[PDB]
Amino acid sequence: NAIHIGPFSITPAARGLHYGGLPHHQWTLYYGPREMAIKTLPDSYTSSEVRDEFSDIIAEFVIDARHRYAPDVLELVNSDGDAVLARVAVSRLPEALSGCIPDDRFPYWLLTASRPRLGLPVTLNEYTALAVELSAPPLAWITGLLPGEVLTHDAEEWRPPTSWELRHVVGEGSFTGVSGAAAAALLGMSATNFRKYTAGDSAANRQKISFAAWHYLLDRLGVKRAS
Amino acid sequence: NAIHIGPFSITPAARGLHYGGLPHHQWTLYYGPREMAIKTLPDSYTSSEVRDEFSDIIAEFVIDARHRYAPDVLELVNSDGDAVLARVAVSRLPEALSGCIPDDRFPYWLLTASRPRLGLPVTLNEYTALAVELSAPPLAWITGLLPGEVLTHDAEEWRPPTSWELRHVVGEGSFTGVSGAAAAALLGMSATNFRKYTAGDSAANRQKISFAAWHYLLDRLGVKRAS
Amino acid sequence: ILSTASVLAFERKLDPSDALMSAGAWAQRDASQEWPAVTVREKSVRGTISNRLKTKDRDPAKLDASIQSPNLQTVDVANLPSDADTLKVRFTLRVLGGAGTPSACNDAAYRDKLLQTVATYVNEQGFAELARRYAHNLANARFLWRNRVGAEAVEVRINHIRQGEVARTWRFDALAIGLRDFKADAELDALAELIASGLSGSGHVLLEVVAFARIGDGQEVFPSQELILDKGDKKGQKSKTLYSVRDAAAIHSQKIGNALRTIDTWYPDEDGLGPIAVEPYGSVTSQGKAYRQPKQKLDFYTLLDNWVLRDEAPAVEQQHYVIANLIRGGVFGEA
């Protein structure tokens, strides 16, 4: 009786033991193939208690993955160099940056927040254009946990995500927190036709999501901008 | 031998006449069901000459439809009221606007360009948030020529576009100027499977485009933002 | 009737020790008991991004931003001294015998059938093929893993140690004996006879194996790497730790043991690729692939179940493979 919380799975050890006189089982928490933890929990534990034993490790994983794959931050400053006027989390860099110290020849500069700064002089209309073009969605860090060939725009190199990669973004335990019904309503499908995507093996009536449906779903969940 | 330029169609009158001794035919230029023009062109006119006779009327239609369905413009101004700092073409209004005259209590204001102005005091970070959220794509005016129930995000009310509505955005004569091959490559589909969408009647192997594919295509052509 | 046991476990034969590294000069190697140990030092490492970028050709300013803030690390390293050119790797290996008896079993009928099956295997042929292959893997210095690659001259001295003193000595040129095929030799077959006498329970085998590899003055040696507790982002710098016993760089005992049992040449894919280590679903991690897949009927578990339960004795090569897996030991139970 395994337990699935998004991409995580908690499985018991198929033969218990007796600790302190009481029957126990070893539960292993996996994130895909990587084994994350082992606990020894008693029997007569409901599955909610088994979930709330590993919820702390799952939450620390979410904290570390959110901080590690955070998108970049550009800062709009004035001509002196201090006194930040605006910040924008970008998912890409504006391609014309090259290491600059702002002077008073131009009144608005766009620097990286990383310390050997790159920057560019802007004039509040091309800043708005760059911020509209390059901004990052509120859940861009989930793109750090995805293989990168399922996130590409090149249709020749794209391969459809597996069920485990699909469970990062769709499901009640996923990192977006969006159920299969709401994600079916986002794509204009039925819940059953969408549950066909989340089976796991190609024999049990599982077809793969298409290129346009996957990228539009990543757009609508707020994960990839998909311009 | 009708001629199709995007949504426009030029058809001859099925029995000619003799003008000035020479055989002529009446060519009618339609935009869907609405008849736009009639000319009397001679025979021994190639189809390029028939196209370049009506190209001026087609271009004036494009000019008027581009000016009529232009999206709104918000302006970021300073505390005095004059001296525009930035402009942004939005496809929606920021929902908190209510008629304002800027004073010096706040240094940045966001007004409508329409004359009984609405406005809002902003602080260059929520201006960037509003500009990222509400900006308009470079070809938003084509959404003026579309029925509005093919542009909705509500999947219950959405109906798929017809072939004539699909020819506004896809095709060499369309208003985007994007061929069927390039639009097939945008959706990660073969040119033949995409040409299945552009047949015209459901008997001749024509299936309808899906919700996610249509909205992702409108996103990738730069027509609707599709957030 | 006669289902397999729910728990079943075998202790390993051919126990090696941790192999210690020391350094000296070639042609002093017969006086090589006072050779100083190879010690593990630290050095700083600054490096740029050389891996594949996730966003391939997009974002060229992020690449230039990452070059301007490169990765600084601290790394454990081990080299020879600048006046020594020879590495010496020493361990002791003991061969025990009793290869059929499990250390834990549920069914008595299953363990009796298994013991009788191993007894008929030993009565048909001895351990002579398996001990010949083990003596080959001792003869070439395969247990020098990367310290053998590109060495000039490798020489292996093997001392059979009966009482506290040496009873017999073998001397091998480990570069002549290849890592590819199993030849024949009088000294090698004497060593194989000793190993087979150890595996048969008819004697107590203790060997001391010493390998000498001529590398170069101050060149880098390769001990076993330890595990690092994700200290590449919080403390950040220590990104490689090397195994060391008492201020002396060492190789793990199971690394030596994996090099010893690289005898499996009978896997169904090919045999021009060389021998691999014996394992159930005989798998190489560096190739990411399982030879002896369970879809084919040549993994350890199906061969054992056919040989023990249904009495379908496989070919003699697969019998060598199954007995090599029993010599390896492991937890062979319902999991």
Add this chain to the structure above:
Amino acid sequence: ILSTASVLAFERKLDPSDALMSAGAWAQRDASQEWPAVTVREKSVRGTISNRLKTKDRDPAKLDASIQSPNLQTVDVANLPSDADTLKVRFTLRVLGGAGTPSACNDAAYRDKLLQTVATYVNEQGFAELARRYAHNLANARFLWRNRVGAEAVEVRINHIRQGEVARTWRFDALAIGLRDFKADAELDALAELIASGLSGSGHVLLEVVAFARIGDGQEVFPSQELILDKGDKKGQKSKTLYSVRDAAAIHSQKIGNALRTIDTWYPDEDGLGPIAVEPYGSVTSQGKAYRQPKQKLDFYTLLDNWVLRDEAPAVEQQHYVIANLIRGGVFGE
């Protein structure tokens, strides 16, 4: 349907050791076995406010208050003795061979395709161009990084060491052979033939490289610099640490290895700036820039994937660069 392997990694060829520094007098360099090692000492450094300042910290009161309270660091330093003008730098170098075979690879089909692609490269031309450039970077003492700058005379002795004794000896004047162009010579092409014999697997190459640089009496030499962990500096603690093997100033082996593979002259941006080191997205840390950006089709990964998967063999200079990246080694996978 051939795709790249998800795991693919290559061990390095051309392993150098740590370069050890010693010091002596010029024209005693033929008896340079008892030369004492250059040791790393400490010294005190009192600084001053000399960097840029933020505009909030440019008031004259704050600036004079910052000058009145100075910084006092301790710094590792390495100098020649006051009676010696020649720095001797010694290391050894193994040329190994087998440069095509990956040490770990996922696909068998990709491994066979890559092996036969390297085989056709080797059959069309040997390692002779690459070994010529490697023997150049041995000949001009580029592995003296800042120790070479502003020297009177640099001289490199290279001993090919077959058994425990010397099999062959080269001697070069490293200032004649520039850092700029790859010329020809009899002794240099003999060295290139030896290195290409090592890289092809047809021999076992072990060289001992000794460089002599005539600097001046008591001048500063520049060994490899280590990395300090500061935890609330202990009353003006150490701010610079130099590498040393055992009370002997030294250069890191990967520093010597980076100076050895400075052979890439085929990068698209320019050619009058000099050779750079062979890296994927060939990048110079001092320039802060990546030549061979992947938006141009001349980084290592696009060239390798076009050559191996789609059989689009690049120009012969890019083939030189791709095989140089395989000789360098690395982790090339997902």
Add this chain to the structure above:
Amino acid sequence: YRQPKQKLDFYTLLDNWVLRDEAPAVEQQHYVIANLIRGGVFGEAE
């Protein structure tokens, strides 16, 4: 001396000379090239 409130420190003189092409007096040119001979880390602060 050469406080940055006056326009005579090395950083303002170098920025005017290189970016704005306002070459200073020849004494200040000697001072700037003397600073370049001196060496140092002239990059952003902190």
Add this chain to the structure above:
Amino acid sequence: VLGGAGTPSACNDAAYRDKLLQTVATYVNEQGFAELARRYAHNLANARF
């Protein structure tokens, strides 16, 4: 005394590097290092060290 006094040892911007190099080149062509070397030779002459 080494020379090459305009070239930086590390730089971010290539355009700023080229502009700085040509600025020091125009300085050298207008006058050499003669005034600076004169003052350095004076500080060698009087034993200020």
